[PDB]
Design a protein around this ligand. Sequence first.
Ligand SMILES: [Zn+2]
Length: 257
Amino acid sequence: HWGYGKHNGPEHWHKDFPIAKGERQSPVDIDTHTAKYDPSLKPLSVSYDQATSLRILNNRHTINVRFDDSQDKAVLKGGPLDGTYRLIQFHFHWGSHDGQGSEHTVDKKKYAAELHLVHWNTKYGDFGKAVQQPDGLAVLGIFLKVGSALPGLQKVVDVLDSIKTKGKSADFTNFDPRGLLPESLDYWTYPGSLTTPPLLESVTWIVLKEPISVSSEQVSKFRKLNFNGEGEPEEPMVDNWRPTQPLKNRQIKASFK
Ligand SMILES: [Zn+2]
């Protein structure tokens, strides 16, 4: 099974998922000098006040917080998007040390971690239909930068010990994801893919320019998660990021002048 090891990591994925070498792959390097302000982008609308978190899960690849997506309780709209995208889940990618971890880079700089809030196009009816379509998904990407602790994250770090090994999950109600947004919604956007298998080219990426701040101590708790299941050889869940892929014939737009 795919993973982030020497034998099953990003360099291997193409053998089971040949779209790994496709024309709209993610993540990418964002070159801030050449991404152009686009005036046709509408205002971005992140509306998460009625979000209903359900459960948190270690799936052997990351930790993910799943939400009730039965109605428009948490949606992303505007910016490059047409129509309404419902929030389904958020997860993270992070490194074995604070100098790497993010999937997107900005002028080749890596952050300590990246948060991905995953939304699907309500016109396709559910996540599983949506993920098969070019305009099916929208992922809001937010960098984590080492500094002051973020209170908004502390409820996640606090439960990590209960989901240390793969397959483990826990109740995770009343978590408000607005606590994971920076002040600014300035963003870059480009058409891309899922950054994990099956690497489907169904994602409009919206990557916020402003990182949220997390402490060294908070990121370290992520590093005590495990890829392995209970009682197998330990394998710390670190460096669960895919390297940047070639932009090819795509445009990164900026939302801001
Ligand atoms: Zn898997």
